[PDB]
Scaffold this active site. Structure first.
Site, mmCIF file in Angstrom:
data_model
loop_
_atom_site.group_PDB
_atom_site.id
_atom_site.type_symbol
_atom_site.label_atom_id
_atom_site.label_comp_id
_atom_site.label_asym_id
_atom_site.label_seq_id
_atom_site.Cartn_x
_atom_site.Cartn_y
_atom_site.Cartn_z
ATOM 1 N N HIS A 297 39.591 38.429 46.483
ATOM 2 C CA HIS A 297 40.233 38.868 45.237
ATOM 3 C C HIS A 297 41.533 38.076 45.037
ATOM 4 O O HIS A 297 42.131 37.576 46.006
ATOM 5 C CB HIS A 297 40.572 40.365 45.265
ATOM 6 C CG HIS A 297 39.472 41.236 45.775
ATOM 7 N ND1 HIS A 297 38.400 41.621 44.994
ATOM 8 C CD2 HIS A 297 39.280 41.812 46.987
ATOM 9 C CE1 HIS A 297 37.593 42.392 45.708
ATOM 10 N NE2 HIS A 297 38.102 42.519 46.921
ATOM 11 N N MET B 110 37.195 44.250 37.065
ATOM 12 C CA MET B 110 38.206 44.482 38.103
ATOM 13 C C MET B 110 39.605 44.218 37.564
ATOM 14 O O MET B 110 40.162 43.148 37.731
ATOM 15 C CB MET B 110 37.944 43.644 39.357
ATOM 16 C CG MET B 110 38.679 44.182 40.588
ATOM 17 S SD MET B 110 38.374 43.336 42.161
ATOM 18 C CE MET B 110 39.738 44.025 43.079
ATOM 19 N N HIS C 104 36.118 38.713 40.010
ATOM 20 C CA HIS C 104 35.410 39.915 39.563
ATOM 21 C C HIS C 104 35.779 40.363 38.144
ATOM 22 O O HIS C 104 35.653 41.544 37.786
ATOM 23 C CB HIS C 104 35.588 41.025 40.588
ATOM 24 C CG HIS C 104 35.241 40.597 41.973
ATOM 25 N ND1 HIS C 104 36.143 40.642 43.014
ATOM 26 C CD2 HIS C 104 34.103 40.066 42.479
ATOM 27 C CE1 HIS C 104 35.563 40.176 44.110
ATOM 28 N NE2 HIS C 104 34.326 39.817 43.811
HETATM 29 CU CU CU Z 1 38.158 41.172 42.979
#
Ligand code: CU
Ligand code: CU
Ligand code: CU
Ligand code: CU
Ligand code: CU
Ligand code: CU
Ligand code: ZN
Ligand code: ZN
Ligand code: ZN
Ligand code: ZN
Ligand code: ZN
Ligand code: ZN
Ligand code: ZN
Ligand code: ZN
Ligand code: ZN
Ligand code: ZN
Ligand code: ZN
Ligand code: ZN
Ligand code: ZN
Ligand code: ZN
Lengths: 106, 106, 106, 106, 106, 106
Positions: free
Chosen positions: C40, C98, C93
């Site tokens: 992330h 997200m 994402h």
């Molecule tokens: Cu992510």
């Protein structure tokens, strides 16, 4: 004092900035508008701006991808900006030659 | 006052910086040259520079990909730079452990 | 004065920041901890922070991917940060929504 | 009747098949083992097998990625297989020239 | 003689096949329906089907990505199919453990 | 009896098969030649060829990416191929609508 619009992805479907080359005057603004076949972004390399200034190239780069049509980004070239050429490129479409050049005149 | 050259991708074709570890003195310069298997870039994470200064880590990173052979990026470590280690890596080749470490000494 | 932890990727396995929306005060800190399904990152668009300041959005963005579990990034919101909402997202994402939002209060 | 073993990724960490060229006799078997820097796969283009038979090239390819250390894939070249060369490559590492060639002899 | 529907992406937003495990009888059919967070595909490895038959694993794999909701793929397990377990996975979401298993009973 | 050439990527630089739609007879051949903006591949979905035959769609698909200019793939449509439409696409440029269609006539 004017705003030059640059389309990110030609209406035709070609992967270009149009217009690719723009000449502007101190006080003017270039506005990139997300057009065809996103995502696009706008990168200036360290060596591709007046005085090869990384500080300036980084400040101007919009590395974050732009996805939905309508998304935009403006750089307004105040008289702090040094005159000369600002060569930029779109990362996802570098292969395609999605390139642009802004010239700040005198 | 000298310039250390770091090759991006070993001549062998191995995906490392070469030399990966370098010690430098204040006023010296590190210059990365694009060698084997482009593209590469140079990233310094926030926590990987003296005082874990994100401001500084960001200044130093060259996140833009270097594609063509011979392309180069220099950092010159003037007396503003804190003494200590600057650990970096190549994003595309993170998986291969393409990592490096500059040590600013005394 | 406190540190608000935000998990990157929910325990359940959903691609979310948890908690997504957070209200902090001047002096407080937001810490992102790498949780499930890495990698992330944490991106602030230029238009998504008070005053639409790119300088600010860039300073705050952690564009470098966080990979290993437990990796963290803190932003500590001092008197200097303008009150208002800072809306962020995770590049990998983004498709999954997200997204997150920090609100600096008074 | 023997089994030749080809390592995927050299011990050195180089992105090649090792040994890249192998000569085999009818009834022998080539077995690829996942070694360094996964993931890899094995592709034979239509034009790269005896008689440029796509039917055969497809039978032989293992386009699915091999991720974990020790994973293996065998081809056994029975008397149905035409004599000649079978040239292959790894998709993820095409750029690095991760290529190989099996020669079925006599 | 029945058709078992498998959702590609759980309603919740989780990256799974649901149900992940299905038991079927000769003559039955499994139908995969594209659900949340596309793209998905359906791969069976050579070693992951009865008798480790690559011919059979390839025949059954739907490697092509499925993008729009509603897109589907059926495998109907006639009595030519050997009994036992057919372990499959989604390539884009292998990292997430997007996995499934079909058991052909007696 | 003839060979119909299909350029992969238009001269102009558009991401298209040119010509997109082609009508051939039994005995004729379609040859795809790699033109602009590679890589491209040629995929037939299972539902997109006469009789909805996956066997057929798979036999015809050239999923391997074609990279270098001038690379080619021919399908020559004999008496054996069922009359009807074979609809294909290019995986990398699916977003761009890089699609095509072959019609076997009588
Ligand atoms: Cu992510
Ligand atoms: Cu672009
Ligand atoms: Cu690298
Ligand atoms: Cu490989
Ligand atoms: Cu999936
Ligand atoms: Cu294409
Ligand atoms: Zn003007
Ligand atoms: Zn540069
Ligand atoms: Zn020195
Ligand atoms: Zn960090
Ligand atoms: Zn407190
Ligand atoms: Zn507080
Ligand atoms: Zn923006
Ligand atoms: Zn032998
Ligand atoms: Zn081919
Ligand atoms: Zn049943
Ligand atoms: Zn396998
Ligand atoms: Zn003719
Ligand atoms: Zn004809
Ligand atoms: Zn399909």
């Amino acid at each position: 004092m004017e705003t030059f619009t640059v389309k990110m992805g030609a209406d035709s479907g070609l992967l270009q900035f149009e217009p690719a080359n723009v000449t502007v005057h101190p006080g003017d603004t270039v506005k990139w508008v997300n057009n065809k076949l996103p995502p696009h972004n706008i990168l200036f390399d360290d060596k591709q701006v007046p005085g090869a200034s990384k500080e300036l190239a980084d400040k101007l780069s919009h590395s974050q991808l732009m996805f939905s049509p309508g998304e935009s980004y403006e750089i307004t070239f105040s008289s702090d900006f040094p005159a000369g050429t600002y060569t930029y490129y779109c990362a996802p479409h570098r292969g395609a030659g999605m390139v642009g050049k802004i010239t700040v005149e005198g």
